[PDB]
C-alpha cells in the first residue's frame, strides 16, 4: 500500500524549525519579523487561506495582520495602501491575496509590492530570478510540492514528472523548480494542458515517477492512470467537503507515496511562506 | 512524404512585413530603427550570426552597427560600453552575442541592458515579462519556432508536444510559448532533460505530435521516434566537416507529416523574429 505522507505534519515541523530561526533573531537583538496580508472581498476560500497564514505566523514568532478592504475598492487605494506598507520599515512581508476584484488589475497590484517584502515571490523580478536561479524567494506552493519530494526522500535525477495544471500560473512554476539543474530537480518535466484530454494525459502519467496533480478536476487521477508505486502529489482543491483531484483510496493501493487532500500540499504552502517571511526581514 | 518547411521562405515573408512597419513608421517621420550589436572574441558561429543579423537589418531597412571588441576585455569595459549605448539615444536595440569569455558573468551582462533595449529578452525583468504574459519582445528562436508552427497551421491545442533541450535556457522558453494559453499554444509540452536516455525520451517522442529538438547531438531523433504526421522542427546545431541539425532529415522525411531543414530552418527565423523586435523597441 502507499505510504501517506502527511503535509500537515511536515509542516509543522517545518514551522518548529522557523520559530527557532525567528527566536534566535530576535534574542540576537533584532526586530521581530512582521508580516502584512491584504485581503479585498468575502471569497471564503481566501478568508480560510489567510487565517491560516496569519495562525501560523503566531505558532513561529511572527507578528501579522491581515488588512481586509471591501470589494468596491478602488486600484488605486490599493496601491496608495501598498505604498504606505512598501516604506513601514516595520513590514518586512507583504503578500495581496488573490484573486481579486475584476476592475483591479492582478499584475500591477503584485509587481507594486516592494521585491524585498514580495514573500509570496509574484513581482516580476522575482518571477524572472526564479527562471534563472537567480532568486531568494520562492513561490510558495511550488516550493512547498518541492520540500513535499525532498524530505521524503522521493528520487527525481533523471525520472519522469508530470504536473497537470489548471492554469500557466500553477503548473510551470512548479515544473520550473522540477526540471532545473540540481533546489532544483533535474527531472524530464511534462506539463499537462486543462485541453488535453483525459485519455492523452493518461498516456503521460503511466510513464511518470511523480504525479502532480494540480487541476482542480475531482477524480482527475485515478489507479489506471499511475505506474506501480510512483508519487502522487495532490494540489487540487475542490468543493458539502473538500477533496483533491486525487482518487485517494483508488490510487493508494498503486501508488508508492501519496498525499491527502486536505493536510497535505495546503499546509506545506502556509510553512514555505513563514520560510520566506524571514528570509525577507534578514535581507 | 514530409512536407519540408523552408525557413527562408517564411523568414522572407516576416521580413518584408517588418520592412513594411519600419517604412511607414520612418515615413510619420520618425527616427529610422537602430540595432547595436556587440560582439566580443573571435567564435567563428559568433561572427556568422552577427552577419546574418545585421545582413537582415539592412534589408528591412533598420540601421546597425557592430562592435567588435578583443575576448581579453574586462567585465568593467564591457559594462562601461553597455551603459553607454544604454543612454545613446540613437540606439533602440541592443544585443551582447553570446558566449562571452569564461572571465565574464554572462547573466551580470544580461541585465545590463535597458529592459527597454533588450531586443533578445535575456534581461531578468523580461523572462518575468514573458513568464507572466506582460511582454513586449520575445526571445528570437522560441518565437521563431512558434511562428513556424502558426504560419504552417500546424495544430497545438491540446496536443502533445516534446522539447529536447540542451539547458534550461533553451528548453523553458520554447516550452512556455507552447503552454502558454492562446502567442500560446494551450499544448501539453514535455521538456526532456540534458543527457536524458535516447531510449528514455522516444517513449515521450513517440507520443508527440510536435518534436521540438534542440540538443545539439547529431541523429538524436530517427524515424523510430515519431509517429506518423507528426511535426518535427530541428533546432540542434552541430559540425561533423558541415552542419547538421538533431534530427536524421532523410530517415524522419519519410515518417513525420512536416520537417524543418538545418540550415535553413529555424536558423533564418531566429534573425526575422529579431527583426521584430527590434521595430518593436523602437516604438516604445
Ligand atoms: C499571479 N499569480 C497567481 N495568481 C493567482 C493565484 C490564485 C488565484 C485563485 O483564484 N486561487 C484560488 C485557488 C488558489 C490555489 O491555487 O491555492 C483561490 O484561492 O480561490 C488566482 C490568481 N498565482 C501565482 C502567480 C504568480 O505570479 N506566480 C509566480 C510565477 C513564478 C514562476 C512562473 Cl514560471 C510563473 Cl508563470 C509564475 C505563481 O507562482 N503563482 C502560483
Ligand atoms: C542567458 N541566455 C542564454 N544564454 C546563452 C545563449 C547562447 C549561448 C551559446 O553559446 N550559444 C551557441 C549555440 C547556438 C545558439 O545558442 O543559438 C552559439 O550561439 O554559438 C550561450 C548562452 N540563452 C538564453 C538566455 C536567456 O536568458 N533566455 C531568456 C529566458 C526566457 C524565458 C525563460 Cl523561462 C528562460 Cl529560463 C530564459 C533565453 O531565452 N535564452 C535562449
Ligand atoms: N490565492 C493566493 N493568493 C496569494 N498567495 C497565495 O499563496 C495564494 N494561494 C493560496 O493561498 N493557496 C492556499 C490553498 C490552501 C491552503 C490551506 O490552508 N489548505 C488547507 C485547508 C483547506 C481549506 O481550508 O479549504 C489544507 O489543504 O489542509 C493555504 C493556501
Ligand atoms: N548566441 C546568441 N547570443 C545572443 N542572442 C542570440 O540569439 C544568440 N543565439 C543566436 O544568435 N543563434 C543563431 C543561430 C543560427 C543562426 C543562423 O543564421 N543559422 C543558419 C546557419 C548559419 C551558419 O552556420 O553559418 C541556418 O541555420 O540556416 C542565427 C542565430
Redesign the interface.
Given at each position: 500500500e502507499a505510504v501517506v505522507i502527511s503535509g500537515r505534519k511536515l509542516a509543522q515541523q517545518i514551522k518548529q524549525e522557523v520559530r527557532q530561526e525567528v527566536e534566535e533573531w530576535v534574542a540576537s537583538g533584532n526586530k521581530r519579523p512582521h508580516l502584512s496580508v491584504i485581503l479585498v472581498g468575502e471569497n471564503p476560500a481566501s478568508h480560510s487561506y489567510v487565517l491560516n497564514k496569519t495562525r501560523a505566523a503566531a505558532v513561529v514568532g511572527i507578528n501579522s495582520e491581515t488588512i481586509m478592504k471591501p470589494a468596491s475598492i478602488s486600484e488605486e487605494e490599493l496601491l496608495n495602501l501598498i505604498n504606505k506598507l512598501n516604506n513601514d520599515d516595520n513590514v518586512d512581508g507583504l503578500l495581496v491575496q488573490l484573486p481579486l476584484p475584476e476592475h483591479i488589475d492582478e499584475?500591477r497590484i503584485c509587481n507594486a509590492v516592494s521585491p524585498d517584502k514580495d514573500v509570496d515571490g509574484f513581482?516580476?523580478?522575482?518571477?524572472?530570478?526564479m527562471?534563472?536561479?537567480?532568486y531568494s524567494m520562492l513561490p510558495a506552493t511550488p516550493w512547498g510540492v518541492w520540500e513535499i519530494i525532498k524530505r521524503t526522500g522521493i528520487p527525481t535525477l533523471?525520472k519522469?514528472v508530470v504536473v497537470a495544471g489548471r492554469?500557466?500560473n500553477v503548473?510551470?512554476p512548479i515544473?520550473?523548480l522540477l526540471?532545473?539543474?540540481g533546489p532544483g530537480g533535474?527531472?524530464?518535466?511534462?506539463?499537462?494542458?486543462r485541453?488535453?484530454?483525459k485519455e492523452?494525459?493518461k498516456?503521460?502519467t503511466i510513464?511518470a515517477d511523480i504525479v502532480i496533480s494540480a487541476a482542480g478536476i475531482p477524480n482527475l487521477i485515478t489507479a489506471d492512470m499511475i505506474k506501480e508505486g510512483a508519487a502522487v502529489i495532490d494540489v487540487g482543491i475542490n468543493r458539502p467537503k473538500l477533496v483533491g483531484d486525487v482518487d485517494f483510496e483508488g490510487v493508494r493501493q498503486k501508488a508508492g507515496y501519496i498525499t491527502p487532500v486536505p493536510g497535505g500540499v495546503g499546509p506545506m504552502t502556509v510553512a514555505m511562506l513563514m520560510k520566506n517571511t524571514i528570509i525577507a526581514a534578514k535581507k
Amino acid at each position: 500500500e502507499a505510504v501517506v505522507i502527511s503535509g500537515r505534519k511536515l509542516a509543522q515541523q517545518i514551522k518548529q524549525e522557523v520559530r527557532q530561526e525567528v527566536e534566535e533573531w530576535v534574542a540576537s537583538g533584532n526586530k521581530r519579523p512582521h508580516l502584512s496580508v491584504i485581503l479585498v472581498g468575502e471569497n471564503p476560500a481566501s478568508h480560510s487561506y489567510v487565517l491560516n497564514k496569519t495562525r501560523a505566523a503566531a505558532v513561529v514568532g511572527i507578528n501579522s495582520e491581515t488588512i481586509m478592504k471591501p470589494a468596491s475598492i478602488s486600484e488605486e487605494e490599493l496601491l496608495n495602501l501598498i505604498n504606505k506598507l512598501n516604506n513601514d520599515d516595520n513590514v518586512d512581508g507583504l503578500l495581496v491575496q488573490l484573486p481579486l476584484p475584476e476592475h483591479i488589475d492582478e499584475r500591477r497590484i503584485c509587481n507594486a509590492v516592494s521585491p524585498d517584502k514580495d514573500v509570496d515571490g509574484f513581482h516580476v523580478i522575482n518571477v524572472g530570478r526564479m527562471c534563472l536561479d537567480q532568486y531568494s524567494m520562492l513561490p510558495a506552493t511550488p516550493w512547498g510540492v518541492w520540500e513535499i519530494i525532498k524530505r521524503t526522500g522521493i528520487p527525481t535525477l533523471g525520472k519522469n514528472v508530470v504536473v497537470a495544471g489548471r492554469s500557466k500560473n500553477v503548473g510551470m512554476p512548479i515544473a520550473m523548480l522540477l526540471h532545473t539543474d540540481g533546489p532544483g530537480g533535474d527531472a524530464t518535466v511534462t506539463i499537462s494542458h486543462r485541453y488535453t484530454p483525459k485519455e492523452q494525459l493518461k498516456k503521460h502519467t503511466i510513464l511518470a515517477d511523480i504525479v502532480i496533480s494540480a487541476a482542480g478536476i475531482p477524480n482527475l487521477i485515478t489507479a489506471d492512470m499511475i505506474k506501480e508505486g510512483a508519487a502522487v502529489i495532490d494540489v487540487g482543491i475542490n468543493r458539502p467537503k473538500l477533496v483533491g483531484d486525487v482518487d485517494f483510496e483508488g490510487v493508494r493501493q498503486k501508488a508508492g507515496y501519496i498525499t491527502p487532500v486536505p493536510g497535505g500540499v495546503g499546509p506545506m504552502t502556509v510553512a514555505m511562506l513563514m520560510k520566506n517571511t524571514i528570509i525577507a526581514a534578514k535581507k
